[PDB]
UniProtKB/Swiss-Prot annotation, chain A:
Probably a homodimer. Interacts with CdaR. May interact with GlmM. The gene is cdaA. It catalyses: 2 ATP = 3',3'-c-di-AMP + 2 diphosphate. Disruption phenotype: Increased sensitivity to the beta-lactam antibiotic cefuroxime (CEF), upon overexpression of the c-di-AMP phosphodiesterase GdpP greatly increased sensitivity to CEF. Double disA-cdaA mutants cannot be made, suggesting they are lethal, while double disA-cdaS and cdaA-cdaS mutants are viable. Depletion of cdaA in double disA-cdaA deletion cells leads to cell lysis. Exponentially growing cells are extremely sensitive to H(2)O(2), no change in response to methyl methanesulfonate. This is Cyclic di-AMP synthase CdaA.
């Protein structure tokens, strides 16, 4: 169906962008809103309400640029805003070598049903936060499975 | 001012802030503002954005060596319609010989539409505008803003 094709296109755009940033160790934080509304966090960023493309996602997270500091929040198959605040988790059970991107992802996943993707600037490793847990060192296939399950 | 007029002022502020940033840093840019002649055929050659304007997004688009920086951004009213768009190259002899493809594209679209195109030179940081087949170079910030306000 059209809705199915659209979801698959968005998944492909996300994984292409994450693959580019993982290879270049570009830090990134991308939260996908689900049933829990995230408007209060969306309002903290720069409004975009933009079509998703791998190109735009990459251009957003380029280091040393206006939009790269904070989270992209996606809602209704669009990029709602960039450079958004997410709350930092205080969980003592996050790997101690991880910093604030990952604690922000876990933080929002504590208080919403959202799925957040993190690319590490240290390693290029890719992780996902959901339900208060961080799933680390994902392959491309693992991230796709998580996006399709979501 | 009405909401339409306030929105236009916000859009002009975003554009001028972005252009000023990119001029200082010698970041090449090519930004076409659609007016009454529709540019859909050119918009369709780019990557669709249909995004709300901000100075931040405009700057991020044109950062060198990124997916969206090559080609034109085309704006429709208060939205960035698409980036990395094709524009036709002018053959006009009144384009300074040292100028490259961004200025020739801007004059090109200005020959077949009523649009206003802003160009930042990656060589000098100079700001120019193309409109109605003419290129006006080395604009001050004040001149650019007045041109946009008049547009
Ligand atoms: C060298 O390649 C890698 O680091 C990947 N295994 C990481 C990676 C994970 C998800 C994705 F959508 C793209 C890339
Ligand atoms: Mg002069």
């Amino acid at each position: 169906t059209p809705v199915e094709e659209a979801q698959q296109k968005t998944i492909e755009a996300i994984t292409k962008a994450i693959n580019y940033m993982a290879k270049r160790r570009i830090g990134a934080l991308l939260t996908i809103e689900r049933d829990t509304g995230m408007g209060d966090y969306i309002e903290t960023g720069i409004p975009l309400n933009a079509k998703v493309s791998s190109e735009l996602l990459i251009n957003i997270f380029i280091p040393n640029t206006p939009l790269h500091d904070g989270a992209v929040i996606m809602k209704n198959n669009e990029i709602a805003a960039a450079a958004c605040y997410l709350p930092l988790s205080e969980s003592p059970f996050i790997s101690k070598e991880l910093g604030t991107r990952h604690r922000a992802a876990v933080g929002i996943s504590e208080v919403t049903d959202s799925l957040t993707i993190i690319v590490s600037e240290e390693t290029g490793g890719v992780s996902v936060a959901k339900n208060g847990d961080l799933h680390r060192e994902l392959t491309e296939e693992a991230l796709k499975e998580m996006l399709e399950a979501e």
